[PDB]
Design a protein around this nucleic acid. Structure first.
Lengths: 63, 77, 93, 46
RNA sequence: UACGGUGCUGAAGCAACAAAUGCCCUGCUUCCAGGAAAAGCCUCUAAGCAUCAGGUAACAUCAAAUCGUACCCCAAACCG
RNA sequence: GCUCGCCGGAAGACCAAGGGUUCCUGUCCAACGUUAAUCGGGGCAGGGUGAGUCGACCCCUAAGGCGAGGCCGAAAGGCGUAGUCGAUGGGAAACAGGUUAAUAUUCCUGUACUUGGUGUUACUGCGAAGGGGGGACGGAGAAGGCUAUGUUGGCCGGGCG
RNA sequence: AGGACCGAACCGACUAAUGUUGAAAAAUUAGCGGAUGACUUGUGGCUGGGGGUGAAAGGCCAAUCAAACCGGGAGAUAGCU
RNA sequence: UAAGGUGAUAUGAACCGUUAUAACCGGCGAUUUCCGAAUGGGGAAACCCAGUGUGUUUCGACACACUAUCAUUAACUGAAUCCAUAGGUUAAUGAGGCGAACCGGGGGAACUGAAACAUCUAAGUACCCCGAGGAAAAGAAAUCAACCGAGAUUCCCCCAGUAGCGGCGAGCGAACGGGGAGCAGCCCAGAGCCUGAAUCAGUGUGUGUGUUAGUGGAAGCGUCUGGAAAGGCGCGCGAUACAGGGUGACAGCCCCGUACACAAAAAUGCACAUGCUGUGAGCUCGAUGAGUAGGGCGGGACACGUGGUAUCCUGUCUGAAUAUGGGGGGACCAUCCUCCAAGGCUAAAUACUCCUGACUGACCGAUAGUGAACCAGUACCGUGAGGGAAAGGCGAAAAGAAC
């Protein structure tokens, strides 16, 4: 689960993407419809960042 | 191609030529037949394509010193 | 399962339509942006999973070509999709 | 009046189309010679 | 409200005869030049199977991928 | 705005190929339409393409192409039996109302039905890549029973100069 | 019934005229004519270079053809220009 | 390595900063949509439709990971037909497509010359095809000479415009052998003795030195002209560094640099030393290949033409000898020398480019040089193969057009 652990099953990093991308990236672009923040150039907050979670889903240790 | 499967005889480049000064191409084609042989290591008959000069070798050498060592990898015969 | 939440990467920013947004965006019907697959079945799942309201109607279409986008080069809008969502009793998404 | 060539993207794509040319030794060579001259399109039907 | 548009309401709503290049028609009848196949469909049994599944008549209720979609046309949107 | 004229089997209406932002409002008038241009399929923006049932796909496949195993050929390439594409053919699924600046058998309303599951009610042997009937095919003529189509009268509403 | 008489749609070349630096890569205007056939036609195929196709002119084979078109041998050869 | 960056037209918000992912780069190693070898099958430039197996559920449809062809290896299955095998299935390896030029083999002209034409010349060119390696190809003898002897092949200058061939024409045109580049030879037909000894590749390392990410490195100031100098002048100073290039008119002394000099996560070439694996230094004695050499007939390749025509491939019939045996030595014979086939392999000195690096031109400068310095193989022509343009340079700087 956490980066201090070793050789855990890699499949749980797909739930990290559920929490950290699927429940985040659309709300980041849709909160403008609730009058909140309204800026568009914000996708760096999941772009390049969540790639490290996918790199860890594609990991062979513990699989 | 008319291949002698028991020796690898193929057709060859060559000219007809006669008592004429004009010379024209021929390309020598074989005569082509079939023959059936027994393989004592596989206890079955097999049919192979054969030709002049080539069919003269196998009967002379013997199948136990020709056909019994003919496979390069298997050739599905 | 059946049906998993792993597909709900769908939807982008709000969009505008003279056919809905300009009278219904806060009361019954809203228009949104999408990727190259508009994910027609999962649009309403992504609304139910974010705003907890039931959906009554979903349309997506595809808009094609449309001339000029540069003052010195060739440019188009080409093939692009939308999402048009009507709510069952929800108002303001 | 009538023309000897009438407009048809179906019969153009059947004779001169990319996969149609590629599926023949000589048409695949026309495409190899397109790449030798540097022609920007390899199909004019799509 | 706006004689500004945008809705509401609403009379009578029939058979007499002629019938088109359309139906019944993959018809019927006639003819010599004697005039596609296959699957869906219906039906026979084998295989297999059981208060199932499938087959029929009448129903309620839920679901229905994808391509295409703007516009012109005996022509200023095709081609010359 | 009033008035005139011509076409009216087209100089009209609908469908398709082929093309491709052409649709509509909102403006712009250098260049384009061998002009005037305030117009415009032109410039430049903004809006617009809502389908279970419509055309395609489904499933079968003609001419033809491809083509295994196999054969012919240095070879490019080709023959031919399965197989696989392919209809111009054979095979499940929506009508006519009025709406938008611009859309629609695509919307909204009313009403209808085919496919697939599940539930209801009565009757029940279903079934090959096999067997049977069909699908299913020429040319023309002639009987029967009609319908779009149209007028008169009825009936309705208007008018009486 | 019909390789039948006239005749729309459909087809189409014979006469005449206009056109001919055109609207025009062959049309236009008028007429005579083909219209169940040895016919015509929508849609998709198949036939290629001395090979095709032709009720057969060496006509037609994408305007080209007593031998098409493109690219190569090829800057071939010219007692001549 | 480094403090300014987040590519450019492109600005601004936002965002890393300057401090242990700022940007940028080297090593290796993931990620790699669909078309495309494309590998379930179909097909169409980016599209279409299935199956196998397992699971899930309103058992209304989701969605993994896998399925090609050929050859070989194994395991199960299996038709006529018992056993078997074709056929069927499953797992594994090999190939597949791509990449500049070179390169072996295959198909194979006409023109041209013969002041005319067929043989001959031209040409195994042109063009097309197959196939493959870092080179391809050749090789250490039944070869080549000439009584002297050679002792692999290829590449270079020569031999030689001679021999030989030749409508005794036009012309094609050697070998022997020299000077040179470049020098690796072996095994099977079979055993022991010797001991792993020579030599080469691969692989774990070491050392010396390059390559792929680098930063250091001496001197020029004043004065005048000009809007501005890298200029004039005064002269001064460096130079193992007076090379490009850049910077606002000519830069040895301003910048990136040069001569001169180093440093190392990982990857890696050359050479010196070494372990390991595979090959095995040296000695000695056997033994010398029979369907293919001859032979008749016919082609091919030979510089070499049907001639008095050897040799080596090769189509077809036919098929051999043993030391008073056999092949060849360019008719044939003898004598004689030399080789002894009928088994397999071979250094790179040679060939070449997309690429990597160094050097160079008495090279061009917008009609030049490529058609193409420019959003050019674009616009444009044709059904199509295939044809095919116009168009560069404001300025030091965008200061670029307000008022």
């Amino acid at each position: 689960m956490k980066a201090k652990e070793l050789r855990e099953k890699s499949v749980e990093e797909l739930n990290t993407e559920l929490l950290n991308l699927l429940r985040e990236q659309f709300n980041l672009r849709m909160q403008a419809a609730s009058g909140q923040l309204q800026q568009s150039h914000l996708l760096k907050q999941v772009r390049r960042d969540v790639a490290r979670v996918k790199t860890l889903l594609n990991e062979k240790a513990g699989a | 191609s008319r291949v002698c499967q028991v020796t690898g005889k193929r057709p060859v480049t060559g000219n007809n030529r006669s008592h004429a000064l004009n010379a024209t191409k021929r390309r020598f084609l074989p005569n082509l037949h079939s023959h059936r042989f027994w393989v004592e290591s596989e206890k079955r008959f097999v049919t192979l394509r054969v030709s002049a000069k080539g069919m003269r070798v196998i009967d002379k050498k013997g199948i136990d010193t020709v056909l019994a060592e003919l496979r390069a990898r298997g050739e599905k015969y | 399962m059946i049906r998993e939440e792993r597909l709900l990467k769908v939807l982008r920013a709000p969009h505008v339509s003279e056919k809905a947004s300009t009278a219904m965006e806060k009361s019954n019907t809203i228009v949104l942006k999408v990727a190259k697959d508009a994910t027609k079945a999962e649009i309403k799942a992504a609304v139910q999973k974010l705003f907890e309201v039931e959906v009554e109607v979903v349309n997506t279409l595809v808009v094609k070509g449309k001339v000029k986008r540069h003052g010195q080069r060739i440019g188009r809008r080409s093939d692009w999709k939308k999402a048009y969502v009507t709510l069952k009793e929800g108002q303001n998404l | 009046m009538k023309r000897t060539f009438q407009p048809s993207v179906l019969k153009r794509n059947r004779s001169h189309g990319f996969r149609a040319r590629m599926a023949t030794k000589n048409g695949r060579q026309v495409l190899a010679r397109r790449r030798a001259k540097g022609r920007a399109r390899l199909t004019v039907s799509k």
